[PDB]
Subunit: 231 residues, 2 copies
Amino acid sequence: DVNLYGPGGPHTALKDIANKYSEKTGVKVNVNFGPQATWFEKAKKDADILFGASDQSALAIASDFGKDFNVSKIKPLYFREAIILTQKGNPLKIKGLKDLANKKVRIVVPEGAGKSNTSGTGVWEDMIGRTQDIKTIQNFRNNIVAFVPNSGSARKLFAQDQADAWITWIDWSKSNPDIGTAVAIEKDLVVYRTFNVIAKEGASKETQDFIAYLSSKEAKEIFKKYGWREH
Amino acid sequence: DVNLYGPGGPHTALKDIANKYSEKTGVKVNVNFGPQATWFEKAKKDADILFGASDQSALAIASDFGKDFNVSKIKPLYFREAIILTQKGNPLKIKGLKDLANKKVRIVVPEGAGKSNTSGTGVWEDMIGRTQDIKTIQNFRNNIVAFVPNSGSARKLFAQDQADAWITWIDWSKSNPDIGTAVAIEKDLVVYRTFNVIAKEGASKETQDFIAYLSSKEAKEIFKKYGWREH
């Protein structure tokens, strides 16, 4: 049994994959996902691979495992763009990031605030900062109704219609076409973050083989289905 | 006495500003700077203002102060661009981030890893990610010889000639012109992060007065000479 731990998000692609791989290879692959705290303890007992939704978060998470893992072995495999998720039908007619700053709107972004490891940390300031206008940066920040510890928390706040816009990743929208309406971010502002994996110290051949499979022709197309790219 | 606490970096601009302000007003303004741990205990006692070197790190640090501060009051005032700091003379002829990915170089970057609050978190991946090329991202990451807790840790590693390139901020070069040679990052890739301030809850009239002064014509020009912009 090859066991994987990581955040919600990439788990959808990974489930499709471990299930196909399980079929064809007979090897059982478990994909555990969610907020770190929800799986941390089981994962300390039997984690074979930690997967991540960005580099800074995977580095944080892998570091929490002591010498069970080796953070320097983190392998970036795909990337996807950030998006704006608006409520169904985009009632406020949001056109992008600059539009969020200029309008009266409620924004949720995941920010770890140094106590939670989340793919969101640093995204919004890096995107809106590329406008190089402090006024727009200021106006955007003022529209932020909540900084949440992780993507799951943002999704929840969002589904309760307490935010008009959620700064998230394309895969989240691909994985959950029912949630909201996706709005593309200005090409000159958007950031792209990565999917990665790291095998435990002393990982089995079965593990290694599954990692190798994540780069297979068939894994690439499944990741691609969810918006994950190589180029 | 108005007491400010924050990271090294913006401290240089703030030192000049504070000096000039005391001259005019007779109000004593102390600028305490360094890694959070070196000043956290004292600040919990007398901090009037927390200043920041990015938004995510400022949100993290201000959160550590609990009920004394209300993090929604963080004020972005200026931004500056990330840079590549190469050893004096730029012996390896580095021309930007793509060049780093391609050459055999040793790069140092500040990354909090969830256990330290630093302006560097998320920076390298957001810049090199905008190449939208996984091999480039992979190649850049393979050249990173050290992920350090903060900018001061990177400065020291760099000063000991243990890194060829340090991904930092223009202000670190402006404040330390002899320390190395700054290489401009490609326009389509570079990120800009902010200087910010937050007054403690129940801040004095004089504390607020100094904050206002940070947006004065005089402060603007001092901020400008260290690379902090508006525009």
